[PDB]
Amino acid sequence: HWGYDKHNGPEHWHKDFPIANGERQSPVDIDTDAVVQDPALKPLALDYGEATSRRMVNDGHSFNVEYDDSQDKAVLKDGPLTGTYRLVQFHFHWGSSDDQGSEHTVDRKKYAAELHLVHWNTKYGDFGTAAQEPDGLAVVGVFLKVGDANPALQKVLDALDSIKTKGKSTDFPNFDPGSLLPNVLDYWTYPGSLTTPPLLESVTWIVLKEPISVSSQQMLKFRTLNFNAEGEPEELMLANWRPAQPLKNRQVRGFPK
Ligand SMILES: [Zn+2]
């Protein structure tokens, strides 16, 4: 088992998951001075118009909104990518107070939470196959910046009472993941990993420059979830972010700049 406390948190994961100290781990700090433009980069092409949400699940480390990835209803193309990537799920990371919780940082600045929209490359057939390949996954990272209430986010938060403990799920149809995107789609990109065990090095990271908003009040609702299953002792889901990992050999690129 793994988690986010002093003893089982990120600093210890390397013992059970050696790849934690590897060459393309995420998240990273994005130093905007070192960011470079690249004329090969394209605008991000998100097509979430037919996206079909199925359910919401507490997986014991976070909560996921699952999408129907059996066809091309919710696809991600272009940006830094070649091919088509299907949306399989999104989930969030957040911290114990509003001044922390994002996984990526910008010139060391942290936000209150971060949304990850996970996509797999269709040339690999399924998520499991895709997850093992360097070009297999694409994750769009969206910062949640504390400020005004976010009404799109509120629909997600209203279901959280129904999935308090590990393993619970609730049906969650009709949620549009495009409603949790900012209006401008400028992004930073770098080759990285999943930010949770097994920490697979299979992700092209697409971190959006513009955050979406969230209220302090709304942030308290994230923190009502439990890491523990029902019947075990309570362990509140107050914080589930991995800190910045060393950039090592990698280049962060920016679009449009
Ligand atoms: Zn994540």
Numbering used by the authors: 4 to 260
Give passages from the manuscript.
A well-studied carbonic anhydrase II was selected for rational design as it has efficient CO2 hydration activity and could be heterologously expressed in Escherichia coli. Thus, to better understand the key factors controlling halophilicity in enzymes and to develop a halotolerant biocatalyst for hypersaline conditions, we undertook rational enzyme design by selecting just one of several mechanisms present in halophilic enzymes: increasing the incidence of acidic residues on the enzyme surface. Herein, we describe for the first time the successful redesign of a mesohalophile enzyme to an extremely halotolerant orthologue, that is, one that is active at 3 M NaCl and above, by altering 18 surface residues. In contrast to suggestions that large differences in accessible solvent area, non-polar surface area or absence of large hydrophobic amino acids are the important features that allow halophilic enzymes to function optimally in high-salt environments, we have found that increasing the number and distribution of surface acidic groups alone is sufficient to impart this characteristic.
The conversion from mesohalophile to extreme halotolerant enzyme is conducted in stages to assess the effects of substitutions on overall protein stability and degree of halotolerance. Crystal structures of WT and engineered enzymes were obtained to confirm the presence of changed residues, that active site residue positioning was unaffected and also to compare the overall structural similarity of the designed proteins with that of WT. The structures of the four engineered enzymes superposed almost perfectly with the WT enzyme (maximum root mean square deviation (RMSD)=0.42 Å for M4) with no significant differences apparent in their secondary structures. Some of the orientations of other surface residues of M1–M4 were also altered compared with the WT, although none, with the exception of N62D, were in the vicinity of the active site. Up to 18 amino acid substitutions were made to the enzyme surface of bCAII, but this did not significantly alter the secondary structure, catalytic activity or stability of the designed enzymes, compared with WT, in the presence of added salts.
